Design a protein around this ligand. Structure first.
Ligand SMILES: Cc1cc2nc3c(=O)[nH]c(=O)nc-3n(C[C@H](O)[C@H](O)[C@H](O)COP(=O)(O)OP(=O)(O)OC[C@H]3O[C@@H](n4cnc5c(N)ncnc54)[C@H](O)[C@@H]3O)c2cc1C
Ligand SMILES: Cc1cc2nc3c(=O)[nH]c(=O)nc-3n(C[C@H](O)[C@H](O)[C@H](O)COP(=O)(O)OP(=O)(O)OC[C@H]3O[C@@H](n4cnc5c(N)ncnc54)[C@H](O)[C@@H]3O)c2cc1C
Ligand SMILES: O=c1ccn([C@@H]2O[C@H](COP(=O)(O)OP(=O)(O)O[C@H]3O[C@H](CO)[C@H](O)[C@H](O)[C@H]3O)[C@@H](O)[C@H]2O)c(=O)[nH]1
Ligand SMILES: O=c1ccn([C@@H]2O[C@H](COP(=O)(O)OP(=O)(O)O[C@H]3O[C@H](CO)[C@H](O)[C@H](O)[C@H]3O)[C@@H](O)[C@H]2O)c(=O)[nH]1
Lengths: 383, 378
């Protein structure tokens, strides 16, 4: 039987789930409260300069998942692109992530890889058995000088808290490299779609069994016209924010135009706490295969997400997790709905992770029709 | 009618010309005086470390030519790779080619691209190599990055050399440190030797190694394609075309000796020109043991492999005399870096070889004479 499907959101989560089910003969209705598709991945051109702007932040595709990589290659031309971030601090410009060039520049040395290991080991504090905090992880592995130059001020700005109050996991992620490789990402596949993510998602949305209505909020009365709802809007918003709002950081993007090359790279971090923006992005450098004389730039400022701001990074401390638990207990009592995505599950997700989870979630719904069982509320562990 | 074709050299030029004609039914005899195929592109695995070594120095494939890219992708799997050269000088490490990071780090500034343009304009003269440098980038940069390395590389002071070359390396006022601006760039997964081995794999191709060209052989063939040195072909009767040669001192490090494929040393007081750490040309492989080369530049004497053609006034006048006798040859075409006395990238060599076979095939169907050169050189 051709099931009737409501999908709330036309970002990756919605577009991908809706595409898998269209292909199996289901009638998919995809709604979005915005006047364009794409969700947080939306990009669009600026009038004046013709620069393709990544409107909700630089969106660099990177994955080790060849399945996901092949999927997006059916819907776009993926161009090579290697993210190479610079950082301004202490009247100097550095290479990130921390590598052999950064170390040799910062400490004015000409160390080989093995000499740099010994130098950083000496600066590190190996008397810390298991770093719990962001500060401890930095003091254990990179030492005070590097910590205070590149990490402390940036991290206070980004998070609104002292690094002694943030988890070690945040920094556990970042490569301390003892060679001259300055690719920001380790993933095997990496790039940017030639015509942008909007066009890519438009291709994913281009199927006979998909209708997309824009400028249309979800209304709780609708659910009864559909056999199943996939919801990628905020979990707390779905329940009227009745227990309070899940905490997020948000960003203000302050747009400006320059006639020429404003900074000469896509991403420049400002690691000093005394520079009020976290970074400056110059969007034309995300599309290096194009030429543009004019340039759209963003200064980016991090702040607590208030009622009307777009939620970007989930805070996910005990408070926020306690709040999350209360929304979970209502969710578990639902039937015929599945909460997905960054907003539906209160998790930061990369594009390729979002895509993989959407493929899985469609798969689960297909298998559950074939097994005449019930579709669960979450297809991923969130507790 | 299938022609008997003799091809001298089993590098890119010979291999590609020979495959194009083998495919069209011609009988192809390729010879090479060395004990291996591949010419100067030849690579091989060191026994001890299993590292694929670029025997005649680093070879990075780069091209804007999509026909050529597609052509090698038929014979190899091209792995992505971006050449990113570092340079040690004055107690610091920098990226090359000179870019906005080099400038900022060198002068201790936080310039934007236009601010750096104004900084370099100031430092330039306004008041040849040593001329173009001082006018365009200033004393400090010229002396740090160019003056020492140029003397070591060419064996001459820069005061003695033409504006071009440096004109070919403009300061980049952005943070892009890719050595090559070309659309396509990569390394073959199994190395150039396999890639050339596949180009040579055809029933109509016979390859003989450790085999010297002998002029007496010419009369056994309908045509010869010659990719060995043009001057040698004519017995060096007017003198030897000037080249720089290179010596490589091999060593083995257990670990990562320097942490990048190529580190240049720009100081004249450092005797090698650069150090290459070969495992960095294959970043998809992992190797605990590392093969490295300190690299030294000298005048190419009679027993040395010729690397860089000098191509200054005397050498070009000398070339001209060998051109003017090649032009009266029949049933022979001179090709390649060595046959035409030019430095040629691998992509350009492949593009010219494909065009050379094409001109030959078209010369048979039109009953026309095959020219001696298929590119201009005089
Ligand atoms: C600042 C930032 C930078 C990032 N950079 C990268 C990066 O470089 N690389 C990378 O891989 N990932 C990056 N990401 C993550 C990436 O954006 C996500 O993986 C992707 O957006 C997740 O897609 P989604 O469809 O699940 O959610 P979303 O894109 O948020 O889409 C959800 C959609 O639901 C709609 N909606 C919500 N509620 C309703 C409702 N009530 N009624 C109707 N419509 C509704 C919204 O309008 C939205 O369009 C970044 C994320 C952020 C926040
Ligand atoms: C130091 C150096 C670095 C380079 N780096 C790059 C790079 O990074 N990227 C790039 O694209 N290109 C690079 N190149 C250029 C690259 O090597 C050439 O494009 C390639 O060698 C050209 O192939 P060929 O067949 O024309 O010449 P060769 O490879 O030189 O082959 C000529 C062959 O002919 C044989 N031969 C000569 N005379 C005789 C004879 N008398 N009898 C029998 N056989 C003979 C020789 O033994 C040799 O095998 C580099 C070159 C040099 C010198
Ligand atoms: O110059 C810098 C750069 C980073 N950081 C610290 O390192 C953290 C990680 O920063 P990234 O800019 O490298 O990462 P994002 O927060 O932009 O996104 C990262 O974290 C996400 C989880 O929230 C995803 O896992 C994603 O794949 C990963 O790149 C920052 O919050 C910050 O605390 C600094 O202190 N200084
Ligand atoms: O640290 C350096 C590096 C280079 N140079 C000067 O710049 C010239 C160019 O040298 P590169 O190492 O940049 O390049 P190659 O000479 O090895 O080969 C280059 O020039 C060739 C022509 O000979 C080809 O066009 C090729 O594609 C291109 O990479 C040198 O002769 C040298 O005099 C310096 O002064 N200092």
């Amino acid at each position: 039987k051709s099931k009737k499907i409501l999908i709330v959101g036309a970002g990756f989560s919605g577009a991908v789930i809706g595409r898998q089910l269209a292909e199996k003969g289901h009638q998919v209705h995809i709604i979005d409260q915005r006047d364009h598709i794409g969700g947080n991945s939306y990009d669009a051109r600026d009038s004046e300069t013709n620069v393709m702007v990544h409107v909700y932040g630089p969106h660099i595709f990177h994955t080790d998942n060849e399945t996901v990589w092949n999927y997006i290659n059916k819907h776009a031309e993926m161009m090579p692109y290697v993210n190479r971030v610079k950082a301004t601090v202490n009247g100097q410009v550095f290479s990130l992530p921390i590598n052999l060039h950064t170390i040799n520049q910062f400490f004015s040395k000409t160390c080989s890889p093995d000499e740099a290991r010994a130098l950083i080991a000496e600066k590190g504090d190996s008397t810390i058995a298991d770093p719990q905090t962001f500060e401890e992880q930095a003091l254990r592995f990179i030492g005070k000088e590097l910590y205070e130059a590149f990490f402390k001020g940036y991290t206070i700005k980004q998070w609104g808290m002292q690094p002694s109050e943030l988890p070690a996991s945040i920094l556990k992620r970042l490569p301390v490299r003892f060679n001259y490789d300055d690719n920001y990402f380790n993933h095997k596949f990496q790039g940017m779609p030639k015509c942008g993510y909007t066009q890519m998602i438009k291709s994913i949305l281009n199927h006979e069994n998909i209708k997309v209505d824009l400028q249309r909020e979800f209304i709780v009365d609708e659910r009864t016209h559909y056999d199943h709802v996939f919801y990628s809007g905020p979990l707390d918003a779905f329940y009227g924010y009745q227990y309070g709002r899940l905490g997020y950081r948000t960003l203000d993007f302050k747009k400006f135009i320059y006639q020429g090359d404003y900074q000469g790279c896509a991403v420049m971090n400002y690691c000093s706490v005394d520079v009020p923006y976290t970074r400056i992005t110059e969007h034309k450098y995300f599309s290096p295969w194009e030429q543009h004389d004019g340039s759209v730039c963003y200064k980016e400022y991090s702040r607590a997400c208030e009622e009307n701001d777009i939620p970007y990074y989930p805070i996910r401390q005990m408070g926020e997790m306690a709040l999350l638990e209360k929304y979970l207990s209502l969710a578990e009592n639902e039937t015929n709905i599945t909460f997905v995505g960054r907003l539906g599950t209160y998790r930061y997700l990369d594009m390729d992770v979002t895509i993989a989870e959407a493929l899985k979630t469609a798969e689960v719904y297909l298998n559950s029709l074939t097994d005449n069982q019930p579709m669960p509320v979450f297809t991923v562990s969130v507790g």
